[PDB]
Amino acid sequence: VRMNVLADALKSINNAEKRGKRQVLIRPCSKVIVRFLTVMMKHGYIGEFEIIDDHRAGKIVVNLTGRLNKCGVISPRFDVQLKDLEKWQNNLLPSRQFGFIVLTTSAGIMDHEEARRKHTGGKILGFFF
């Protein structure tokens, strides 16, 4: 069955980006996917996207810019304490220059650099570089 919805959504973007498609329709829309994609947009890896309401779980059409090497998920949602965010961002990300670990904290869904600044640990969602 469909256990993880964010996992499906990020595999769909990743497959479409490799194949060189210009936009992709990720199906089962959720608050966690939208809040993930806003962060991904604010750093400028995706374009503007449009979420499509049928009276169910919505759909999303993401306009893709060819500047996304990988967007992955970590399952299960491990409880990243603040000091251990180094060893996570060490072994997940390409270099210390670019790439982001997005993790769901007390405040909201935000990347490792913001969570480090705000002084908050939380549960890991995924990574994008």
Partner 1 sequence: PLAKDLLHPSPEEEKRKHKKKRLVQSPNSYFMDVKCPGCYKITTVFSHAQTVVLCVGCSTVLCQPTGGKARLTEGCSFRRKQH
Partner RNA sequence: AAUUCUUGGACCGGCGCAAGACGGACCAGAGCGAAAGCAUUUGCCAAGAAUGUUUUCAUUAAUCAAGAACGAAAGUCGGAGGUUCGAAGACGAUCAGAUACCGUCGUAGUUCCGACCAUAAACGAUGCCGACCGGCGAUGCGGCGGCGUUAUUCCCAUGACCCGCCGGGCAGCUUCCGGGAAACCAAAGUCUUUGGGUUCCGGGGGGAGUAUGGUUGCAAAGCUGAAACUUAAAGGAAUUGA
Q: What residue ranges bind RNA (CB under 7 A)?
A: 1-4, 7-8, 11-12, 14-16, 18-19, 24, 27, 69-70, 72-76, 92, 94
Q: Is the peptide bond before 28 cis (omega within 30 degrees of 0)?
A: no
| Residues 73, 81 contacting (CB under 8 angstroms) | no
The correct pick among 35, 43, 59, 116 for binding partner 1 (CB under 8 A) is: 59
User: 18 to 37, contacts with partner 1 by CB under 8 A?
Assistant: 20-25
| Triad 3, 90, 92: Cα angle to 5° | 30
Part in contact with partner 1 (CB under 8 A); list of ranges 15-23, 77-85, 90-98, 107-115: 15-23
Q: Decide if residue 44 touches partner 1 (CB under 8 A).
A: no
Return phi, psi of residue 16, to 5°.
-65, -40
Number of H helices, E strands in the chain: 4, 8
User: Which residue number, 13 or 110, has a Cβ lying nearer to partner 1?
Assistant: 13
